[PDB]
Design a binder for this molecule. Structure first.
Ligand code: NAG
Ligand code: NAG
Ligand code: NAG
Ligand code: NAG
Ligand code: NAG
Ligand code: NAG
Ligand code: NAG
Ligand code: NAG
Ligand code: NAG
Ligand code: NAG
Ligand code: NAG
Ligand code: NAG
Lengths: 118, 406, 98, 98, 49
């Protein structure tokens, strides 16, 4: 409305501002913030680590991969599926695999296929 | 009366629904971002304050791993993924409503689709996705259903041993105390009753939204807690302003220290209250998830003799279904019906000897005495095949006279 | 009386007593049938015989010894009241809650 | 020993007692009344303090509904109120104490 | 602070009472409404009633 300048959301935080010199409405969005998770095997095994930036689009932050948990750097996605070693996020687990001894990310396998002859 | 018994002459196959929460939303907080934002001097003062941030982070991480473990305990009972045969014939039993639907990309059963349709910020608060996706939980449910349909209870106690479904339900009847001849005679009626009950389950779930009220209650409580925290972030707690940028752009350091102390104390108290409430709710969710795991082991992976544990009535089967942040159990039970009055006697006196039924009760139609099984009326001629003597006539109270054919 | 109030429970003592009486009557007159469907009438000696058969003892054992088992049950039930009355620590959990 | 067994030749019918808490007292607190009651400016500054009153009231209401649900779950197993027959004979078993 | 401590303690005790009431409901279903094969669940000895 032509008389108010600030906008607020259900959280009582400043979401929109009317520019003083030129009269337009600007939406304010907090620039990308997130958590960092370090994915590592035992230090005795190796010192290689992967980094998961949680809930961050992998642009804002075998090298990079976009998980629904976040952006994972230092892990190579493999289309093979294994049993989960250490959880990462929504169905993706990481492991220290030789196959090329490095950290790999993969969709976890729920179990061996079995079709009973009914 | 001390002479009359009531014996059922028919039965109903009933399917009941039990909804149990399993997991809740995994939330993580950053103490520094919540309390102080990006104010470096606030961060230094908080560092001087104490070491509550690490304790709160430990508690929340424990809750998250707790939720993942709850889902794993409930749904990862099996070690192999079982697939139902392409020809879906199980002696007239229709599991289409229960089995996954290939047409939908999600590969979820129609009941699971109904459940998912019914039950459906940046101040340092983050929501971590669960380790197991909805598709993975659906695949666990499909494997459990396929194993139960194709192998009975065998896959839970070892290798999956194939068995025709009518024979499996006959052995379940034998478990609940009814001879298998009853099922082999009334297979079509039992299949029709099961199909009608399964069809009615979906309409029952759709009609009453209170059935899925527990899962929505969990979601609502988590949302209310997060909203309360965010709102408490806008309180003053005695300070002149509720914004750290305002308190830093209006005041010199030494006199802004007291106001920033007030803000820090208030926000620490709010966040600690949130963590304590989350711990208590996590305890409740563990209780529910342990109950769900016990039911999956005892109702789905086998036949349970515990009364009212798996539905109401004599338990036959149980089928799992994944629901958002929980599980739904379709308990298939045997409910006797069409009861009839009869005259009963503890023993039959013949040739000076007392006779007792090996299994069943003695039933008179007024004129003749037969022996029946307890839960169903199948009269049979009293013979030495289904009686044992073990006693004398005079000692037993209430004995009656009749002939026991050889 | 400075802001603290006690809300009465939804079910009164009479209603809990009626529930208990209904459960007792169902157990005595129908066995376990009323918990799994319609209440099926059955004489109490036959119910005890089938409960004996449940724990692995044949029903002839009950029928031969009906009077002895009835006397033992009556004596035990009569002794329960005296055991409750004599020892106040028996109800210690409810009193602990209060 | 690898040749000997012990077989019972008699039995005892024993009645034991188990006491279980089910519900506790439902209490409600008025945050304003407890903290200051009629002191108006105290109420105003408590309002300035935060929204703890609403959370406390919600927790206590949840506890009360919890207690009612506990009693209902324990005692409302039967859907029909069964009545014992006028003649209280059950093969010599004396239920007058129960 | 006093009232918050009271409510937290009440919540913990309420959790304990839910545990007790769930146990009581299970025993009503399994000991009263049927005969239980579980050892020591429904009294000491072979459960009859
Ligand atoms: C000065 O104020 C007027 C107000 O209408 C605005 O239109 C103008 O853009 C402002 N000056 C500049 C250089 O932005
Ligand atoms: C966020 O991440 C997704 C990943 O698929 C990407 O498509 C999208 O453009 C990103 N948004 C940005 C860059 O803000
Ligand atoms: C592995 O999966 C990704 C995602 O579906 C796909 O882009 C990639 O081509 C796959 N690699 C194969 C099939 O070797
Ligand atoms: C059955 O109960 C009636 C009660 O009127 C009694 O008269 C009769 O003797 C009883 N029959 C027995 C105990 O065999
Ligand atoms: C049992 O019930 C079904 C449906 O209620 C009915 O079709 C059938 O005839 C009944 N059987 C007997 C023996 O009454
Ligand atoms: C019963 O099965 C048939 C095919 O087996 C299917 O067409 C039908 O839809 C099923 N019934 C229901 C209620 O879905
Ligand atoms: C058995 O007889 C009694 C007495 O007439 C009656 O009240 C009851 O309804 C009858 N039950 C059945 C199943 O016929
Ligand atoms: C009882 O059953 C026998 C055998 O079927 C029959 O001959 C007799 O007429 C029946 N009596 C009554 C009253 O139904
Ligand atoms: C039937 O058995 C009873 C035993 O209680 C006996 O007293 C009676 O004489 C018998 N009836 C005969 C032999 O006709
Ligand atoms: C019992 O075991 C002992 C072992 O020394 C053996 O000598 C004895 O023959 C066994 N008795 C029977 C009855 O097997
Ligand atoms: C069992 O004990 C009772 C109680 O003393 C007694 O009356 C009865 O005779 C005993 N039975 C045997 C077979 O000894
Ligand atoms: C036992 O039964 C008798 C006869 O019915 C009765 O008088 C007595 O009150 C009952 N109970 C006790 C405690 O003896």
């Amino acid at each position: 409305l032509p008389f108010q300048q600030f906008g607020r959301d259900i959280a009582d935080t400043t979401d929109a501002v009317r520019d003083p010199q030129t009269l337009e409405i600007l939406d304010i969005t907090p620039c990308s913030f997130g958590g960092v998770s370090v994915i590592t095997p035992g230090t005795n095994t190796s010192n290689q680590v992967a980094v998961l930036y949680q809930g961050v689009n992998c642009t804002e932050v075998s090298n990079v991969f976009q998980t629904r948990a976040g952006c994972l750097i230092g892990a190579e996605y493999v289309n093979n599926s294994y049993e989960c070693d250490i959880p990462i996020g929504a169905g993706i687990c990481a492991s220290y695999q030789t196959q090329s001894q490095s950290i790999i990310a993969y969709t976890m396998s729920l179990g061996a296929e079995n079709s009973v002859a009914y | 009366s001390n002479n009359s018994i009531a014996i059922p002459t028919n039965f109903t196959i009933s399917v009941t629904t039990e909804i149990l929460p399993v997991s809740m939303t995994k939330t993580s907080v950053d103490c520094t971002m919540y309390i102080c934002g990006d104010s470096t001097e606030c961060s230094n003062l908080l560092l001087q304050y104490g070491s509550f941030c690490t304790q709160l982070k430990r508690a929340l991480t424990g809750i998250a791993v707790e939720q993942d473990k709850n889902t794993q305990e409930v749904f990862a009972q099996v070690k192999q993924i079982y697939k139902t045969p392409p020809i879906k014939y199980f002696g007239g039993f229709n599991f289409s409503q229960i089995l996954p639907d290939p047409s939908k990309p999600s590969k979820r059963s129609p009941i699971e689709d109904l459940l998912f349709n019914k039950v459906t910020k940046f101040n340092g608060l983050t929501v971590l996705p669960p380790l197991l996706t909805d598709e993975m939980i659906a695949q666990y449910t499909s494997a459990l259903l396929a194993g139960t349909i194709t192998s009975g209870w065998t896959f839970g106690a070892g290798p999956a041993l194939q068995i025709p479904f009518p024979m499996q339900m006959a052995y379940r009847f034998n478990g609940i105390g009814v001879t298998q001849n009853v099922l082999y005679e009334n297979q079509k009626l039992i299949a029709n009753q099961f199909n009608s009950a399964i069809g009615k389950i979906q309409d029952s779930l759709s009609s009453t939204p209170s059935a899925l009220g527990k899962l929505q209650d969990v979601v609502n409580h988590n949302a209310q807690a997060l909203n309360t925290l965010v709102k408490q972030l806008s309180s003053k707690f005695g300070a002149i302003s509720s914004v750290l940028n305002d308190i830093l752009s209006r005041l010199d350091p030494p006199e802004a220290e007291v106001q920033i102390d007030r803000l820090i104390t208030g926000r620490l108290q709010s966040l600690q209250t949130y963590v304590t409430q989350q711990l208590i709710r996590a305890a409740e969710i563990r209780a529910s998830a342990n109950l769900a795991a016990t039911k999956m082991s005892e109702c789905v992976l086998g036949q349970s003799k515990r009364v009212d544990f798996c539905g109401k009535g004599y338990h036959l089967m149980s089928f799992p279904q994944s629901a958002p942040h929980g599980v739904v159990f379709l308990h298939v039970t045997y409910v006797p019906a069409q009861e009839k009055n009869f005259t009963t006697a503890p023993a039959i006196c013949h040739d000076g000897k007392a006779h007792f039924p090996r299994e069943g009760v003695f039933v008179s139609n007024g004129t003749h005495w037969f022996v029946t099984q307890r839960n169903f009326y199948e009269p049979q001629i009293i013979t030495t095949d289904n009686t044992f003597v073990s006693g004398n006539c005079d000692v037993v109270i209430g004995i009656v006279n009749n002939t026991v054919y050889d």
